[PDB]
Amino acid sequence: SKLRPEMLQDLRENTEFSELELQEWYKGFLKDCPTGILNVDEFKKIYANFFPYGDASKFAEHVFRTFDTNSDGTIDFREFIIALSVTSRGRLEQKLMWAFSMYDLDGNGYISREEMLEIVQAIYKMVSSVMKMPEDESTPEKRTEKIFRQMDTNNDGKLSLEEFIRGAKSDPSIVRLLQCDPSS
Ligand SMILES: [Ca+2]
Ligand SMILES: [Ca+2]
Ligand SMILES: [Ca+2]
């Protein structure tokens, strides 16, 4: 019912959750996923709460690939909570590291254009029914077109991690966030 003391400490180190929150998350996790393992179909049902199932499905699949760090087809409680912790309470630097690890489809250390386009397409499909887009990045190809041509510094047609991180920071939602840096 409850995390072992040895387990608990490993997760306090690798997440930004308190012990109480970890115990509460674990209980609730087993509550909702009795096997102790989340598979892809389950993960799609989670996303389907927030956006329509069919639409959200391909994005969900990519997220799952990334959460599933050992890459076996399921997510244990550890992979879940660590992924949750990073994405929801991580440093900005390490959020983008994780986002990069998602876009780099074949895990070679570079995002190719066709890797980018693919993710961007999935985000657009999930969202299509409910958010209405800017004007110039209001099509996956157009967007992928903006991103590369703002982020590919050395022009090899690939994004390195450092290119990725630097460029993301001129996203408006980051430009906003950064105005809240408590270093004033
Ligand atoms: Ca796994
Ligand atoms: Ca790649
Ligand atoms: Ca490059």
Author numbering: 6 to 189
What does the article say, verbatim?
Mutations at positions T71N and A190T were shown to be critical in development of DYT2 dystonia. The crystal structure of hippocalcin(T71N) and hippocalcin(A190T) did not show any significant conformation difference when compared to the wild-type protein and they have identical crystal packing. Mutation A190T is located at the end of the flexible C-terminal helix, which is predicted to interact with hippocalcin target protein. Change from Ala to Thr does not decrease C-terminus flexibility.This part has no electron density in chain A. As expected, hippocalcin(A190T) presented similar calcium-binding properties to the wild-type protein with Kd = 77 ± 5 nM and n = 1.3 ± 0.1. Oligomerisation upon calcium binding was also observed for the disease-causing mutants hippocalcin(T71N) and hippocalcin(A190T). However, the mutations significantly decreased the oligomer formation when compared to the wild-type protein. Hippocalcin(A190T) showed increased binding to both channels compared to the wild-type protein, suggesting that the mutation in the C-terminus region is important for target interaction, as previously shown for other NCS proteins. For the dystonia-causing mutants hippocalcin(T71N) and hippocalcin(A190T), calcium influx upon stimulation significantly increased to 51% and 62%, respectively, compared to hippocalcin wild-type. For both hippocalcin and hippocalcin(A190T), fluorescence calcium signal decreased by ∼60% in the presence of ω-conotoxin MVIIC and ∼50% in the presence of ω-conotoxin GVIA. These results suggest that the increased calcium response due to hippocalcin(A190T) expression was predominantly due to calcium entry through N-type calcium channels.
